[PDB]
Design an enzyme around this catalytic site. Structure first.
Site, short mmCIF file in Angstrom:
data_model
loop_
_atom_site.label_atom_id
_atom_site.label_comp_id
_atom_site.label_asym_id
_atom_site.label_seq_id
_atom_site.Cartn_x
_atom_site.Cartn_y
_atom_site.Cartn_z
N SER A 92 0.71 -1.06 0.08
CA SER A 92 0.02 -0.09 -0.02
C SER A 92 0.82 1.23 0.07
CB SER A 92 -0.81 0.08 1.30
OG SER A 92 -0.29 0.08 2.55
N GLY B 191 -1.50 -4.69 1.59
CA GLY B 191 -1.31 -5.96 2.24
C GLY B 191 -0.26 -7.08 1.57
N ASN C 195 4.86 -5.88 5.56
CA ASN C 195 3.52 -6.84 5.96
C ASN C 195 3.99 -8.31 6.14
OD1 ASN C 195 1.74 -4.68 5.62
ND2 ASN C 195 1.67 -4.74 3.47
N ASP D 117 -2.56 6.62 10.77
CA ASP D 117 -2.70 5.38 11.66
C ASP D 117 -1.47 4.69 12.20
OD1 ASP D 117 -1.84 4.28 9.39
OD2 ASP D 117 -3.69 3.08 8.93
N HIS E 288 0.31 3.93 7.51
CA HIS E 288 0.14 4.66 6.17
C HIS E 288 0.46 6.29 6.41
CE1 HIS E 288 -2.65 1.16 6.21
NE2 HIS E 288 -2.16 1.01 5.01
#
Length: 212
Positions: free
Chosen positions: A43, A70, A100, A188, A191
């Site tokens: 992402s 992801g 990830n 968050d 990101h």
């Protein structure tokens, strides 16, 4: 062997098939276009295209964005081996993936990234490869910060003597002196916000401009 470097697609356990849909779109993009630069990763790559920084700093370079939210290293490797590197001859491939890879040690993730560079060197030998360092994450100090740092050290050391593979630490210093990351940079703590993307993309654009 290393699950991070064993090519595998994302299994659909939800039912809408969106991962394979994205993959197929990218395949079609490669089939129909002639990019000079290909961006692939998780992402961090995907959402870069969604920002207005893309049509500003990257579109003029003739680029395709194959980021998928992801994705781990093995998923990117599978995509590159299954159609997304076909019908094109880019001068540069940018890689940003590894944050990830939960459940894989830093050493394994490093092997995943090296597998990706090696694949690109084989399928698109004329291309220079840029690998971005994994960003810190979490609001406060945590084991993933240490993992990602360790990955960055091992990856950097691996590409040091590889003169067509370039390691770029695009982190302007997201982790403050008090050990915190601001929600202003990462909404968050993972990101990047529009503001967090600015210095990242600025650094990438400069390197792309130098190499190009």
């Amino acid at each position: 062997e290393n699950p991070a470097s064993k090519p595998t697609p994302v299994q659909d356990v939800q039912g809408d098939g969106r991962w394979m849909s994205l993959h197929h779109r990218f395949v079609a993009d490669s089939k129909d276009k002639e990019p000079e630069v290909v961006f692939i990763g998780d992402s961090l790559v995907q959402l870069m295209h969604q920002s207005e920084i893309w049509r500003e700093l990257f579109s003029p370079l003739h680029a395709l964005n194959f980021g998928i939210g992801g994705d781990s290293t093995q998923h990117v490797l599978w995509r590159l081996e299954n159609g997304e590197l076909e019908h094109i001859r880019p001068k540069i491939v940018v890689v940003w993936v590894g944050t990830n890879n939960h459940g894989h040690t830093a050493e394994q993730v490093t092997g995943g990234i090296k597998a990706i560079v090696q694949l690109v060197n084989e399928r698109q030998p004329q291309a220079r490869v840029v690998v971005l360092g994994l960003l810190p994450r979490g609001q406060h100090p945590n084991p993933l910060r240490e993992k990602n740092r360790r990955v960055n050290e091992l990856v950097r050391a691996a590409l040091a003597g590889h003169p067509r593979a370039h390691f770029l630490d695009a982190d302007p210093g997201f982790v403050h002196s008090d050990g915190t990351i601001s929600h202003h940079d990462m909404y968050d703590y993972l990101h990047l916000s529009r503001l967090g993307y600015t210095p990242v993309c600025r650094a990438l654009h400069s390197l792309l401009l130098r190499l190009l």
